[PDB]
């Protein structure tokens, strides 16, 4: 033949993308959002299945030559039981029937919707969970607290809010002593609008005979009390020991208002 002028290529100098290793990347990949491309480095064909198993909520895409690849989130598969009963975990790892917050090899990532509480997608789980002895004071108050002003008033989230209010109306009419309904009434009072006031009064006014005498003596005085109250020009609530004692979450709106009307001297 003839003597070809041979040239060797300049030394390969990798980049961060080329040096990436998906095995080290669970903390990078779990917080990724919808439509966000998480680049993960070269991936061998015999690993693609492993990586798709580990991250079933993500699509595995081939971005460039030599197996260069990325994960694109497609969905959130977290379950109400694992997402709704906590405001702090955003995902969990499932292995061998067990659920763990921390990553272990062999585990499958499941991810909670980032706005799950803000959407009302937890309302059917927590309406149940919060009732009974499964009640977690901190979680269930937070759940009820946060239902007000949902999705910054997006229409889906505003309906969520309404529907839940009706469901809680029907429940707490039956027995407002049950700690979810006490918190519900407590939080209606904080909202302090026409609709929350008439929801409180509607609920309190449907309580049973025994409830009213155990809890609402301030709102339903004995005739002996009422006719004593006429003598003084102060409203009854300002002196009546039944109202200084009483539990404010069970006062009617009128009575709760009136308690504010009692002039104290500064000091």
């Amino acid at each position, epitope marked *: 033949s003839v003597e070809l002028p041979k040239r060797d290529p300049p030394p390969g100098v990798p980049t961060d993308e080329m040096l990436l290793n998906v095995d080290k990347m669970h903390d990078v990949i779990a917080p990724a959002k919808l439509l966000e491309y998480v680049y993960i480095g070269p991936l061998a064909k015999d690993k693609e299945d492993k990586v798709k198993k580990r991250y079933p909520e993500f699509r595995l895409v081939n971005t460039g030559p030599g197996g260069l690849s990325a994960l694109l989130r497609q969905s959130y598969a977290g379950t109400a039981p694992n997402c709704c009963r906590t405001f702090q975990r955003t995902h969990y790892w499932k292995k061998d029937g067990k659920i763990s917050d921390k990553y272990e090899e062999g585990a499958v990532l499941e991810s909670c919707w980032p706005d799950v509480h803000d959407t009302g997608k937890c309302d059917v789980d927590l309406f149940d969970w919060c009732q009974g002895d499964t009640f977690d004071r901190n979680i269930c108050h937070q759940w009820i607290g946060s239902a007000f002003n949902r999705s910054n008033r997006a229409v889906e989230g505003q309906q969520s809010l309404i529907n839940l209010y009706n469901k809680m109306q029907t429940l707490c009419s039956k027995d407002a002593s049950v700690p979810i309904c006490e918190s519900f009434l407590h939080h209606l009072r904080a909202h302090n609008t026409e609709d929350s006031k008439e929801m409180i009064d509607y609920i309190l*006014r449907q309580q049973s005979a025994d409830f009213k005498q155990k809890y609402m003596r301030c709102s339903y005085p004995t005739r002996d009390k009422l006719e004593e109250s*006429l003598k003084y020009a102060e409203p009854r609530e300002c002196w009546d020991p039944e109202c200084s004692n009483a539990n404010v979450n069970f006062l009617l709106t009128r009575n709760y208002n009136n308690l504010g009307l009692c002039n104290i001297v500064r000091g």
Partner: nanobody
Amino acid sequence: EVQLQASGGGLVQPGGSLRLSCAASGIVFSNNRMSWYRQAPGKQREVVATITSGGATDYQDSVEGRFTISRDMAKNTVYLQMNSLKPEDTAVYFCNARRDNFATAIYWGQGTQVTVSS
């Protein structure tokens, strides 16, 4: 002379409504507790609703939610709204005025009849 004539009663089947009025003269609401009273024959009178000189209200338990008392300052007239009336609301209704911190300056007005029957 202090006048507390009540007016507005009558006949209604149960569930209807009635609005009593008391056009007080000789007394001012700015320093009087005004109250609506009942008296069914055979029984002693009873408070039904009351309003302080500042405007705080209060009710007898059996009428709470159904009745609501209000007042018009410029008209010096107190009202009783009676909704969802029960056969046991049958009584003569009248108004009562009490001077804020005097006790002896108490007055009673003329009754009005409301009866509720099928």
